[PDB]
Amino acid sequence: DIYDPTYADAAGPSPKVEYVWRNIILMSLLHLGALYGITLIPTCKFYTWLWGVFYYFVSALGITAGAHRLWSHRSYKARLPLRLFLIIANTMAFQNDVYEWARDHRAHHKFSETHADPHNSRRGFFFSHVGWLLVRKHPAVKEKGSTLDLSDLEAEKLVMFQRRYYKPGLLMMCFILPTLVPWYFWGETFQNSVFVATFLRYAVVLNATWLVNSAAHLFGYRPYDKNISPRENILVSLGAVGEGFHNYHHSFPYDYSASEYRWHINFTTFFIDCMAALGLAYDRKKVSKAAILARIKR
Numbered sequence: 534d535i536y537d538p539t540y541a542d543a544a545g546p547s548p549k550v551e552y553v554w555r556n557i558i559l560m561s562l563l564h565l566g567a568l569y570g571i572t573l574i575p576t577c578k579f580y581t582w583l584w585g586v587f588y589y590f591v592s593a594l595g596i597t598a599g600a601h602r603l604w605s606h607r608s609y610k611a612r613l614p615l616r617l618f619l620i621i622a623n624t625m626a627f628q629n630d631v632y633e634w635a636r637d638h639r640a641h642h643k644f645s646e647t648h649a650d651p652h653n654s655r656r657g658f659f660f661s662h663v664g665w666l667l668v669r670k671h672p673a674v675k676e677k678g679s680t681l682d683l684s685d686l687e688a689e690k691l692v693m694f695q696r697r698y699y700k701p702g703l704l705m706m707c708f709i710l711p712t713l714v715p716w717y718f719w720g721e722t723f724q725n726s727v728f729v730a731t732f733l734r735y736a737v738v739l740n741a742t743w744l745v746n747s748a749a750h751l752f753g754y755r756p757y758d759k760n761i762s763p764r765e766n767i768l769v770s771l772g773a774v775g776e777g778f779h780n781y782h783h784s785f786p787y788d789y790s791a792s793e794y795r796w797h798i799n800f801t802t803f804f805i806d807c808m809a810a811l812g813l814a815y816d817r818k819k820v821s822k823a824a825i826l827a828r829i830k831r
């Protein structure tokens with residue numbers, strides 16, 4: 534389609550943008566309601582804590598093992614049962630559907646740190662964290678991102694399926710269902726069942742991944758590639774469920790781990806390896822220490 538060159542031309546390094554006010558209000562309201570959910574933590578029952586933490590991890594795996602490694606990068610291959618687990622988990626996590634998530638991410642890698650990068654870190658921290666979700670995509674994103682080969686995803690039935698039935702699926706998996714089962718099973722109050730079991734954990738999962746774009750691209754160390762910007766960040770690797778070794782991963786995206794070392798702080802590699810031993814994941818790419826050593830070259 535088209536674009537307005539007033540939102541593309543810039544004297545400096547950042548053009549003007551169109552504020553999406555539907556998103557600004559909703560994001561603000563999710564976080565305000567999350568801050569309130571923090572204050573309701575000591576009130577909560579023990580089970581809803583376990584429920585909250587548990588729901589956090591599965592949601593993470595739906596993005597980490599699922600949306601990112603399996604589908605965005607095609608690092609490994611997953612048998613049908615695991616496929617179902619990850620696609621359901623990805624709906625629990627309510628980031629954009631696997632198709633759109635991978636599409637943006639395949640551009641995040643190939644056009645890293647340009648205006649074709651959906652979360653361009655050159656724009657700043659706030660933009661890369663959540664700011665890019667509060668504004669219209671810079672024209673270059675779909676101008677250059679229309680290049681990418683998304684055939685592997687389009688041909689995958691399950692991926693396109695959740696893309697269609699996403700609004701119902703995400704409503705259930707991310708809001709209704711995670712609110713009902715504390716309020717109904719271990720007699721949680723509806724108020725805590727809302728602002729903690731859903732509001733708090735969903736906001737937690739959001740930022741935890743946002744730090745992989747924001748925090749991880751400005752803070753850390755680069756023993757693999759000095760010239761690029763993603764950093765090896767331990768906290769982010771711990772915040773995320775393993776995706777914080779970003780200087781490594783942008784250098785080796787097809788790695789079925791996101792790091793040089795398996796299981797180090799990679800809870801997912803451990804998970805994926807468990808899935809492999811069960812016979813549910815099978816084609817793991819592991820980059821030779823040869824190539825990793827051949828790249829101190831940066």
Ligand SMILES: CCCCCCCCCCCCCCCCCC(=O)SCCNC(=O)CCNC(=O)[C@H](O)C(C)(C)COP(=O)(O)OP(=O)(O)OC[C@H]1O[C@@H](n2cnc3c(N)ncnc32)[C@H](O)[C@@H]1OP(=O)(O)O
Nearest residue numbers: 593627628629637666668669670675678679742773774776
């Ligand atoms: C917990 C541990 C897990 C750790 C994870 C570790 C991950 C490691 C690696 C880091 C990966 C980055 C993480 C990503 C996480 C962010 C996901 C969320 O926050 S989401 C949470 C929920 N928050 C939300 O959902 C916020 C809602 N988002 C929005 O409202 C908009 O996207 C907008 C506000 C950003 C402006 O967007 P706007 O410019 O107005 O237009 P639209 O965008 O709507 O689409 C325009 C059309 O052009 C095309 N096109 C677009 N992009 C591309 C592309 N790259 N290419 C090609 N084409 C592209 C396309 O055809 C499209 O049509 P269609 O696709 O519909 O067919």
Ligand SMILES: [Zn+2]
Nearest residue numbers: 745746763779
């Ligand atoms: Zn990145």
Ligand SMILES: [Zn+2]
Nearest residue numbers: 601606782786
């Ligand atoms: Zn990646």
